DNA sequence: GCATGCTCTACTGCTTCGATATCG
DNA sequence: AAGCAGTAGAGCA
DNA sequence: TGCTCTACTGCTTCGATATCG
DNA sequence: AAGCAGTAGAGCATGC
């Protein structure tokens, strides 16, 4: 039933009235958090993690877009503290979608101002690097620049 | 340090006047110097600022991109530097004019607002000008008539109006100048008074208790049958503990 | 409420007659109303720039709102004052502005009723902040909009009763159709002319009420009284100079560091100490020791006995005097003792002496606490606060000394002539009104680039005296007042 | 008698604005 | 970072 | 030889900088 | 200083 609210959230933001987009985004992200964790059939869980992860549309590009604002704080905060329950509904099968989340959280930290949302970016990075241990999967992340 | 100027009343009452400074909030004259660990030195430390446009992923800029923008309501406007160098404000050099005088003693005790107080005193070199000011103040001293002087120091300085109190004493005859507020520095708001109270009335035994308090906690004493006041504890000669 | 705000709906009449020139050739009341609106926004853009404003025209042909009723059209939503909103409101002047209003809406219809009060109420019923004042300044002329049917007037006064149920206060600005009090019609069971004040007495001010400190005073060691220490001569100046990136109209938000021990790298603030240098010997400290040596007492006020009001001369001051007052927030029932001590201080003229440490870590300063009592009459003339005032005293190196070796006499003839001069130049001092030259020319200079009218309006100086108006007030006694007893003659 | 389902209000912490010491 | 008047070293003499 | 400039100079003013309640 | 929210040590009802 999803991707309706995804494209609704994607398209409702471009115009004015930047409190209406906030309340609609709160309602629809609550809808996604209700209607994606409830499902349990594993191929359909793969369908959901292939539905919310697209290179053109989705949550990563939607949180990439409206960061040059101040009104999209509650929805972005709900997204960034929802992804640390989505990294624990699933596991190391997300590993070919990892470096984009790392760059997302890194720019969201070094770009924003308020620590109502700056800390959960470090929460996602401190969950992710705790998970994906010292292996081949530590050579993508340039630790020599992160340090 | 000696300060010379020329006082004017009206069109041409230009009297050359000397002046000195008085009570001022004294400050220290030594700078704390930054020293890194392991070196016990300073010159091997570069402390600097970097001009870094963040807004985004950072693009580090130089100093010649800077418009000194100001706030206006819900936007930010230019006119950085040379525009305000054009339309700045001037007041044509030093000035010690008199606006007028006031016989009312309605300049109260609580509007003085000054970081320094001045003594306009005299002049030097065959001081007929200063005996003219002595005549001026020996006229002004009899009644509650004060002067409202407009003072500035140079063209860099700002203009300020203020009170010129008389001061007739034994050896010196002074006029003492203090600043004054503009009607942008006042603020006045409503308070709940306490005289007409329904809960906060104190009773008479408590009134006599605080009367005994203010009796038995005093510091001034009168004697020697002339009733000039003897008071100890002069908080004008006691040194300040900080620099000590 | 402290961070609470006040709204303002400006309701403008345009049905038939206010657009008329009153068969005159001076000015129309419509453009007079637009003069008043643009002046109150050009005042509150810098005076009180967080109030909530709105402007609504009623009676016209079109209608755009959120409820879709006839003859009601708004242009602004309840918001902060926006310079773009006043750069679109300034175009409605002159004949071409009247033409612009006429070709974007026109005017004239069977105009509104109770429903414009309804759209005011639903304009108020939507904004989620805190409200303290809610006033409607209506701009209309006529005194019977119910000139044909009584049900209109009955439902209008019932709707005004329901708006005064929640208490929304409306008080119009009546235009000058007779120039005053002649048309005293039945517009009186709704509400509970003067416009030059709104035109120019609001130039540049600020409004705030905080507390600045909430300390305690100790008499012996065990008499604790909770006081608040307000400031009443704020010593204001200009808003801060923001830095701006050149082309894309953005801030910079610069950084800073310290490094370079001739090796390069980066050094943290943990390895940093402070020092002082005399010639060769340098005394080294840590920053904890540097901030430690300015520690002498706790935060508070300390009683040190009493004094009579005769020795503390008004020659002595070093600080803008503050004001102190008791509050029943920390210690319960201390205003009772404060009211008793106030009564006996005003009955026995005595004033206290104290030692002051305002913040949590500061060297002390000796203060003196002086009593003060209110003044009042029937017009709620509250002009003086009931409480205590704090005069600040110098200690040791402030009172310097002059060379002291000058004393000459004078002769009593000039006292009466100087009395004549001071009585020529006599005036009661003030009650207000000595506004700031630099700040006034600065805010008008900012206004000139804000609204781009033509140019900097030359803000008139007021600190200068009127030299001709004291020349002719004086007369031709200047030369005799020079050389009556002291001729220079080179 | 030990490990969970379920409320709970005091504590602390960040933001907003305003005020004061500081090197130059 | 900016100015204003005092106060010992050159230049024409 | 005294006056007249002349680079310095103590000392002051806001001004941007930093701290805190 | 005002104020604004949200965590969280601290208890009650319940299962194996």
UniProtKB/Swiss-Prot annotation, chain A:
Subcellular location: Nucleus; Nucleus, Nucleolus; Cytoplasm, Cytosol
Signal peptide: none
Protein modification: Autophosphorylated at two clusters, the T2609 cluster and the S2056 cluster. Autophosphorylation induces a conformational change that leads to remodeling of the DNA-PK complex, requisite for efficient end processing and DNA repair.
N6-acetyllysine: modified positions: 111
Subunit comment: DNA-PK is a heterotrimer of PRKDC and the Ku dimer (composed of XRCC6/Ku70 and XRCC5/Ku86). Formation of this complex may be promoted by interaction with ILF3. Component of the core long-range non-homologous end joining (NHEJ) complex (also named DNA-PK complex) composed of PRKDC, LIG4, XRCC4, XRCC6/Ku70, XRCC5/Ku86 and NHEJ1/XLF. Additional component of the NHEJ complex includes PAXX. Following autophosphorylation, PRKDC dissociates from DNA. Interacts with DNA-PKcs-interacting protein (KIP) with the region upstream the kinase domain.
Disease named in the record: Immunodeficiency 26 with or without neurologic abnormalities: A form of severe combined immunodeficiency characterized by reduced or absent T and B cells, recurrent candidiasis, and lower respiratory tract infections. Some patients show dysmorphic features, severe growth failure, microcephaly, seizures, and impaired neurological functions.
Record-stated family: Belongs to the PI3/PI4-kinase family.
Protein name: DNA-dependent protein kinase catalytic subunit
Residues of the full protein shown: 7 to 153 of 4128
UniProtKB/Swiss-Prot annotation, chain B:
Modified residues (N6-acetyllysine): 21, 88
Membrane-spanning parts: none
Residue intervals of the Ku domain: 9-208
Regulation: induction: In osteoblasts, by FGF2.
Modification comment: ADP-ribosylated by PARP3.
Coiled coil regions in record: none
UniProt-annotated location(s): Nucleus; Nucleus, Nucleolus; Chromosome
Subunit structure: Heterodimer composed of XRCC5/Ku80 and XRCC6/Ku70; heterodimerization stabilizes XRCC5 protein. Component of the core long-range non-homologous end joining (NHEJ) complex (also named DNA-PK complex) composed of PRKDC, LIG4, XRCC4, XRCC6/Ku70, XRCC5/Ku86 and NHEJ1/XLF. Additional component of the NHEJ complex includes PAXX. Following autophosphorylation, PRKDC dissociates from DNA, leading to formation of the short-range NHEJ complex, composed of LIG4, XRCC4, XRCC6/Ku70, XRCC5/Ku86 and NHEJ1/XLF.
Miscellaneous notes: Individuals with systemic lupus erythematosus (SLE) and related disorders produce extremely large amounts of autoantibodies to XRCC6 and XRCC5.
UniProt remark on domains: The EEXXXDDL motif is required for the interaction with catalytic subunit PRKDC and its recruitment to sites of DNA damage.
Name of the featured protein: X-ray repair cross-complementing protein 5
Lineage of the species this protein comes from: Eukaryota, Metazoa, Chordata, Craniata, Vertebrata
Gene of this entry: XRCC5
First-to-last residue of the parent protein present: 245 to 488 of 732
Curated annotation (Swiss-Prot), chain C:
Principal location: nucleus
Superkingdom classification of source: Eukaryota
Domain Ku per the UniProt entry, residue ranges: 217-424
EC number: 3.6.4.-, 4.2.99.-
Record key words, sorted: Acetylation, Activator, ADP-ribosylation, ATP-binding, Chromosome, Cytoplasm, DNA damage, DNA recombination, DNA repair, DNA-binding, Helicase, Host-virus interaction, Hydrolase, Immunity, Innate immunity, Isopeptide bond, Lyase, Methylation, Multifunctional enzyme, Nucleotide-binding, Nucleus, Phosphoprotein, Systemic lupus erythematosus, Transcription, Transcription regulation, Ubl conjugation
Active-site residues, Swiss-Prot/TrEMBL: 1
Annotated Gene Ontology cellular component terms: chromosome, telomeric region; cytosol; DNA-dependent protein kinase complex; DNA-dependent protein kinase-DNA ligase 4 complex; extracellular region; ficolin-1-rich granule lumen; Ku70:Ku80 complex; membrane
Residues with PTM N6-acetyllysine: 1, 273, 287, 294, 417
Record's note on what induces expression: In osteoblasts, by FGF2.
Cross-link Glycyl lysine isopeptide (Lys-Gly) (interchain with G-Cter in SUMO2): residue positions: 243, 273
Residues carrying Phosphothreonine: 411
Stretch list, region Interaction with XRCC5: 329-438
Phosphoserine found at: 21, 262, 433, 476
Mutagenesis / variant outcome for changing residue 1 to A: Diminishes the ability to form a Schiff base. Abolishes adduct formation
GO molecular function, one term: ATP hydrolysis activity
Disulfide bonds: none
Additional free-text comment from the UniProt record: Individuals with systemic lupus erythematosus (SLE) and related disorders produce extremely large amounts of autoantibodies to XRCC5 and XRCC6. Existence of a major autoantigenic epitope or epitopes on the C-terminal 190 amino acids of XRCC6 containing the leucine repeat. The majority of autoantibodies to XRCC6 in most sera from patients with SLE seem to be reactive with this region.
Similarity annotation: Belongs to the ku70 family.
Protein name, per record: X-ray repair cross-complementing protein 6
Organism: Homo sapiens (Human)
Residues shown, of full length: 31 to 534 of 609
């Amino acid at each position: 039933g999803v991707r309706c609210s995804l494209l609704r959230l994607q398209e409702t933001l471009s115009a004015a009235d930047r409190c209406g987009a906030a309340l609609a985004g709160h309602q629809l992200i609550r809808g996604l958090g209700q209607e994606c964790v409830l499902s349990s059939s594993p191929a359909v869980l793969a369908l959901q993690t292939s539905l919310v992860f697209s290179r053109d549309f989705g949550l990563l590009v939607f949180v990439r877009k409206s960061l040059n604002s101040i009104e999209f704080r509650e929805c972005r905060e709900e997204i960034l503290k929802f992804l640390c329950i989505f990294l624990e509904k699933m596991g190391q099968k997300i590993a070919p979608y990892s470096v984009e989340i790392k760059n997302t959280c890194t720019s969201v930290y070094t770009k924003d101002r308020a620590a109502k949302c700056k800390i959960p970016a470090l929460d996602l990075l401190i969950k992710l690097l705790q998970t994906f241990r010292s292996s081949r999967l530590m050579d993508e992340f340039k630790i020599g620049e992160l340090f | 340090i000696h300060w010379p100027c020329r006082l004017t009343i009206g069109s041409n009452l230009s009297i050359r006047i000397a002046a000195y400074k008085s009570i001022l909030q004294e400050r220290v004259k030594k700078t704390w110097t930054v020293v890194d660990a392991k070196t016990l030195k300073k010159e091997d430390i570069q402390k600097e600022t970097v001009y870094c446009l963040n807004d985004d992923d950072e693009t580090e800029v130089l100093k010649e991109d800077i418009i000194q923008g100001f706030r206006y309501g819900s936007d930010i406007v230019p006119f950085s530097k040379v525009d305000e160098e054009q339309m700045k404000y001037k007041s044509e050099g030093k000035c010690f004019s008199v606006l007028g005088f006031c016989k009312s003693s309605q300049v109260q005790r609580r509007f003085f607002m000054g970081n320094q107080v001045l003594k306009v005193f005299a002049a030097r070199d065959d001081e007929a000008a200063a005996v003219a000011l002595s005549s001026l103040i020996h006229a002004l001293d009899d009644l509650d008539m004060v002067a409202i002087v407009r003072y500035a120091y140079d063209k860099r300085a700002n203009p300020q109006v203020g009170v010129a109190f008389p001061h007739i004493k034994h050896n010196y005859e002074c006029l003492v100048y203090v600043q004054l507020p503009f009607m942008e520095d006042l603020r006045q708001y409503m308070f709940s008074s306490l005289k007409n109270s329904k809960k906060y009335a104190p009773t008479e035994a408590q009134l006599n208790a605080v009367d005994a308090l203010i009796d038995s906690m005093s510091l001034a004493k009168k004697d020697e049958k002339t009733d000039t006041l003897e008071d100890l504890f002069p908080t004008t000669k006691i040194p300040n503990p900080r620099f000590q | 409420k402290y961070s609470g705000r006040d709204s303002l709906i400006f309701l403008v009449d345009a049905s038939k007659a206010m657009f008329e020139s009153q068969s005159e050739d001076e000015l129309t009341p419509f453009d007079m109303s637009i003069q008043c609106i643009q002046s109150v926004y050009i005042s509150k853009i810098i005076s009180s720039d967080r109030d909530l404003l709105a402007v609504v025209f009623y009676g016209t042909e079109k209608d755009k709102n959120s409820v879709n009723f006839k003859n009601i059209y708004v242009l602004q939503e309840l918001d902060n004052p926006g310079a773009k909103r006043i750069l679109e409101l300034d175009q409605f002047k002159g004949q071409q502005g009247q033409k612009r209003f006429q070709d974007m809406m026109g005017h004239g219809s069977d105009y509104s009723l109770s429903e414009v009060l309804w759209v005011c109420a639903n304009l108020f019923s939507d904004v989620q902040f805190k409200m303290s004042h809610k006033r409607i300044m209506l701009f209309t002329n006529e005194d019977n909009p119910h000139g044909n049917d009584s049900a209109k007037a009955s439902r209008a006064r019932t709707k005004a009763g329901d708006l005064r149920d929640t208490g929304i206060f409306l008080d119009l600005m009546h235009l000058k159709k007779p120039g005053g009090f002649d048309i005293s019609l039945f517009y009186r069971d709704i509400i509970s002319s003067k416009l030059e004040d709104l035109l120019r007495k609001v130039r540049a001010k600020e409004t705030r009420k905080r507390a600045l400190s909430r300390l305690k005073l100790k008499l012996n060691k065990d008499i604790v009284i909770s006081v608040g220490i307000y400031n009443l001569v704020q010593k204001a100046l200009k808003p801060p100079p923001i830095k701006l990136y050149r082309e894309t109209n953005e801030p910079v938000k610069t950084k800073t560091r310290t490094f370079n021990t001739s090796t390069g790298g980066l050094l943290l603030p943990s390895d940093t100490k402070r020092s002082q240098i005399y010639g060769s010997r340098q005394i080294i400290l840590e920053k904890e020791e540097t901030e430690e040596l300015k520690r002498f007492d706790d935060p508070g006020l300390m009683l040190m006995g009493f004094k009579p009001l005769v020795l503390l001369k008004k020659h002595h001051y070093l600080r803008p005097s503050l004001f102190v007052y008791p509050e029943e927030s920390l210690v319960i029932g201390s205003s009772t003792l404060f009211s008793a001590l106030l009564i006996k201080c005003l009955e026995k003229e005595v004033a206290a002496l104290c030692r002051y440490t305002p913040r949590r870590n500061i060297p002390p300063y000796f203060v003196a606490l002086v009593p003060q009592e209110e003044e009042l009459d029937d017009q709620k003339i509250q002009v003086t606060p009931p409480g205590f005032q704090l005069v600040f005293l110098p200690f040791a190196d402030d009172k310097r000394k002059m060379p002291f070796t000058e004393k000459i006499m004078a002769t009593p003839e000039q006292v009466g002539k100087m009395k004549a001069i001071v009585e020529k130049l006599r005036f009661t001092y003030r009650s207000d009104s000595f506004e700031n030259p630099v700040l006034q020319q600065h805010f008008r200079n900012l206004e000139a680039l804000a609204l781009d009218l033509m140019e900097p309006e030359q803000a008139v100086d007021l600190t200068l005296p009127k030299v001709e108006a004291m020349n002719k007030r004086l007369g031709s006694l200047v030369d005799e007042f020079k050389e009556l007893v002291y001729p220079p003659d080179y």
